[PDB]
């Protein structure tokens, strides 16, 4: 995205702020999705599989990972 490095600013500061800009915007993820056509089946299955993984470790975080091991 747009970075303007003004007066009294070093080099690697500006480079890291540009990397922060790229990781805020997520431009490389949005290019990495658009290299190959994922079918709408694969889109919906990826969405559901990531969601069931997400909450199925989340409820384990909430009550299963709260009881001691030793």
């Amino acid at each position: 995205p747009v970075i303007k490095v003004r007066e009294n600013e070093p080099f690697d500061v500006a480079l890291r702020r540009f990397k922060r800009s790229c990781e805020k915007a997520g431009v490389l993820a949005e290019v990495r999705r658009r290299e190959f056509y994922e079918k709408p089946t694969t889109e919906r299955k990826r969405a559901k599989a990531s969601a069931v993984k997400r909450h199925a470790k989340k409820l384990a975080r909430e009550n299963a990972r709260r009881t001691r091991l030793y």
Binding site: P1, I3, V5, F18, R34
Partner: protein, 117 residues
């Protein structure tokens, strides 16, 4: 041997090759350098070191022009951009500001099919 103070650097980084092209601000180029222009063929063309060497060759490609400072535009993913702009001032420059100008469609055209291996 025409002189102009400030210009624009365009670092088009693909996954196979990085091309550095230093233009003026009206888009007109002054000379270019690639990750395959000197040695560095094949698997060694995709590395960040190849992009660093490409920036170092495009640095001497504008020795006649005498560029004081340039804004750096960055396109495409891949092991290009950060090593390139880090070697860009190491070869001697003042990078004024940095843009990420990579194309993003708004679902415009269909990509090719996913590879099996």
């Amino acid at each position: 041997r025409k002189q102009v103070s400030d210009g624009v650097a365009h670092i088009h980084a693909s996954f196979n090759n990085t091309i550095v092209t230093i233009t003026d601000r009206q888009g007109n180029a002054l000379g270019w350098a690639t990750a395959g222009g000197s040695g560095f063929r094949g698997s060694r063309k995709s590395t960040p070191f190849a992009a660093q060497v490409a920036a170092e060759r495009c640095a001497d490609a504008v020795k006649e022009y005498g560029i004081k400072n340039l804004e750096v535009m960055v396109k495409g993913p891949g092991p290009g951009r950060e090593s390139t702009i880090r070697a860009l001032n190491a070869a001697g420059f003042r990078i004024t500001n940095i843009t990420d100008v990579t194309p993003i469609p708004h679902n415009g055209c269909r990509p090719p099919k996913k590879r099996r291996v």
